[PDB]
A paper describes a structure:
The 2-HCT family of transporters generally translocate molecules with a 2-hydroxycarboxylate motif (HO-CR1R2-COO−), such as citrate, malate and lactate across the plasma membrane, and activity is tightly coupled to energy provided by a sodium or proton gradient as a form of secondary active transport. Our crystal structures reveal that the KpCitS protomer is formed by homologous N-terminal and C-terminal halves with inverted topology, each containing six transmembrane helices (TM 2–5, 7 and TM 8–11, 13) and one helical hairpin (TM 6a/b (or HP1) and TM 12a/b (or HP2)). KpCitS protomer can be divided into two domains; a central dimerization domain (TM 1–4 and 8–10) critical for formation of the dimeric structure, and a peripheral transport domain (TM 5–7 and 11–13) containing residues needed for interaction with citrate and sodium ions. Our results show that the KpCitS has a homodimeric structure in which its dimerization domain remains fixed during the transport cycle due to a hydrogen bond network as well as extensive hydrophobic interactions, while the substrate-loaded transport domain undergoes an elevator-type translocation (i.e. up and down) across the membrane.
The final models showed that two crystal forms of KpCitS were obtained in the citrate-containing droplet. In contrast, the other crystal form (form 2), refined to 3.8 Å resolution, contains two pairs of KpCitS dimers in an asymmetric unit; one has an outward-facing conformation, and the other an asymmetric conformation. For the sake of the accuracy, we selected the structure of the highest resolution dataset from each of the three major conformational states for analysis; thus, the outward-facing, inward-facing, and asymmetric conformations of crystal forms 2, 3, and 4, respectively, are shown throughout this article. In the outward-facing state, the hairpin loops are located close to the membrane/periplasm interface, which appears to favor the entry of external substrate and ions (left). In the outward-facing state the bound citrate is partially exposed to the periplasmic space. However, it is unlikely that it can escape backwards because it is secured by strong hydrogen and electrostatic interactions. In the outward-facing conformation, L408 and I121 are in close proximity, and serve as a latch governing access of substrate to the cytoplasm. In addition, M417 seems to act as a plug preventing substrate exit.
Residue numbers in the entry:
A (entry chain A): 20 to 249, 258 to 445
B (entry chain D): 22 to 238, 258 to 446
The structure:
Amino acid sequence: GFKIFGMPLPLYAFALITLLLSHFYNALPTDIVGGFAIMFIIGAIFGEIGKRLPIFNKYIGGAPVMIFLVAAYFVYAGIFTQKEIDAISNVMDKSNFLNLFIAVLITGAILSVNRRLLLKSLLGYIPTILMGIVGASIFGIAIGLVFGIPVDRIMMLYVLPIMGGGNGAGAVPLSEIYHSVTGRSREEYYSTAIAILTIANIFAIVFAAVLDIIGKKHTWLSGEGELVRKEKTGQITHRETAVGLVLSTTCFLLAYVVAKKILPSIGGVAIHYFAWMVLIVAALNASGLCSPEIKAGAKRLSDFFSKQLLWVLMVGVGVCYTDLQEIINAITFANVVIAAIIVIGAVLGAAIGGWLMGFFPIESAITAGLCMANRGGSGDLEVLSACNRMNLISYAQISSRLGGGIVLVIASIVFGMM
Amino acid sequence: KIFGMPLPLYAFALITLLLSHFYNALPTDIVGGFAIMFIIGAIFGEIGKRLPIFNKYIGGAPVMIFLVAAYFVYAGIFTQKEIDAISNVMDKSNFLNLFIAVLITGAILSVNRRLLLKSLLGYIPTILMGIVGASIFGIAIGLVFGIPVDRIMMLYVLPIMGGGNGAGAVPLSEIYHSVTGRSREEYYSTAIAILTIANIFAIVFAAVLDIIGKKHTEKTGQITHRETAVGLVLSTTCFLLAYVVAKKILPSIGGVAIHYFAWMVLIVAALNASGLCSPEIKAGAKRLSDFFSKQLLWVLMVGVGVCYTDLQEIINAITFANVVIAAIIVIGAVLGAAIGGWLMGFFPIESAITAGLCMANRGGSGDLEVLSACNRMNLISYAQISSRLGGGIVLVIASIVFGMMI
Ligand SMILES: CCCCCCCCO[C@@H]1O[C@H](CO)[C@@H](O)[C@H](O)[C@H]1O
Ligand code: NA
Ligand code: NA
């Protein structure tokens, strides 16, 4: 009766048996039901394992990472069946659980805070991001020349893609800007960019847990899950929580309709729909259209995802947004080192910047540093789960989305300069 | 407030819906889907909830959304994209099964180990007796109207005895499509219509049996999200096992093919009796089922009205023939459960209400409608055994019936 996943070993065995029956008989619906079934079980076991591996389990960050890495190794080693990969992929992409997840988090995180606090951060945050970029560039250029690599490459094939807001946000559009300005094939760029950015993404998740340990070892640096130094609710029901779900989706829809047809770009920046959402939700908070009861509902919902479904999510993240074969194709000692150091440049860059802006250095280096250099949205979840600061999702998204859009403007200029 | 959202807030959402609508910008995925489904379901849910005649016997809040939604597809009110988004949630993502899976699990695990085991020996047989009587009378009156027996079982008997909209119409269409291959909407539209007619007769005879009756005289506390989350694990994992069983291990017990949902009922029921789940977890599954049945039910109907309903066919099968056939099947259940219960040691009137009318009624909403018509509201617990477990039994029987026919 020693529990796995709040399920006693006997009960878990029943499920683990079922998983294996589906696995060996090759019978599985490639849908939500089939997906969650597998994801829950697989996540559960490796979650616990990673939670209790001695060296491997350090801080809180051991459990989310295990599932993620393990799951990727299952795809790479072909342990998953094609139908299983399809089922998981169907939940993450075709059904689009990923966005929902982030949407729920953002909504719940923003609707919990006071209206007075809101605008106070945003003004000091963006500069911190730029500080992180400077540091990411300064260190990149520095290490580039150590390896005898021209600076242009460092900015175009190393720095910019890493800091860029992920696969869809950076690799996809940075190859577009590359082709528009150079004329050389997108694949030539993308293939190198996507590969290297994923390497850095793995370092980002590692250093996230390292900064966690350094934060709890040197309390002066850490805010213990809070970036800024600095109505009570009645009883809650399912309906309030359910309303949280309505608001989570409907806010994403509005943001989507805005970024597609109404206000696709404010200026030189194209605003990614998630960025709009943050502004919409924040606006919705200040408008106070949501009563405290409902505002809690959104929080409560966010908890259910971030604490129950987080393990599930990682199984999906390790499958879809981590091609271990493309990494291998660019694991020359050189890239591994260059990439890692650029991340460290972002860490120190955002640490110093935030410290100057009034935020806690550890949190600043995570939100404005590692969350830039990670693989955008999928990455943010991977990083924030490694340092147990999942409540900063909203900030992480500002860097990955708005900060990613900034990378594009900078990129265009860099490309033009050559 | 609309759907627990104050009118100002709901407006914000309703505005957004219309922006997505007019601008034709909508992700054809879960997020986009639920966004629309929540909002649309919310308004028409309230509308159908406020309507006087319609709420009490027409099914009300759910029926509004499911009919309205169908009219939106038929009248082309929805955009291709919007239909795609909703369909993407219901089929490609397969929310429908998850929904049913969660319900089944929560409904079966909520029955106490003793209640379940004890109920099987006496109450459960009475239910089966009611079904026999419901079938025998149905078949009998079918031929009187020159109706083939297969129709009597598939389009009349089974759907009536099946517990409700979510529990019978929704999954019986699923089993119908999985075994015949014909559209769900063809079945659903006829089934949902007939079953509601019978539901109205059930509430009438409940008051008639009341007059005839008077004329002829371990419960745990600390449930957390994890427990509820475990409910979700068990809901899916139990469906997976059932799926693996139907597809390779035991696709058919004999010449008859057991549909995976039927297996699930047996698996979950087994899991209950095995007591592998502690009361805390067993509640978690219940709580989950509540969240779906009470929050996401409105959403579900928006989806059901889009994919699972054709208006012409459904409008057409409103024939006086149905009125009579349906009523008599109910009477067959009454006499079936009356005789059975009398043989089992229960009072015939009470047996015919709980194991008879509560089967033929519209699942849970129905039980409340029936038990309030005969003042026997204290038998809610029994009524729900019929609507939930007995409904799950109807599914196993239904698979066998379908297989035998084809
Ligand atoms: C104008 C800027 C609007 C977006 C602000 C996003 C930050 C709100 O985010 C919230 O802030 C809290 C206070 O730091 C944290 O405790 C919460 O975990 C975090 O989610
Ligand atoms: Na990045
Ligand atoms: Na019924």
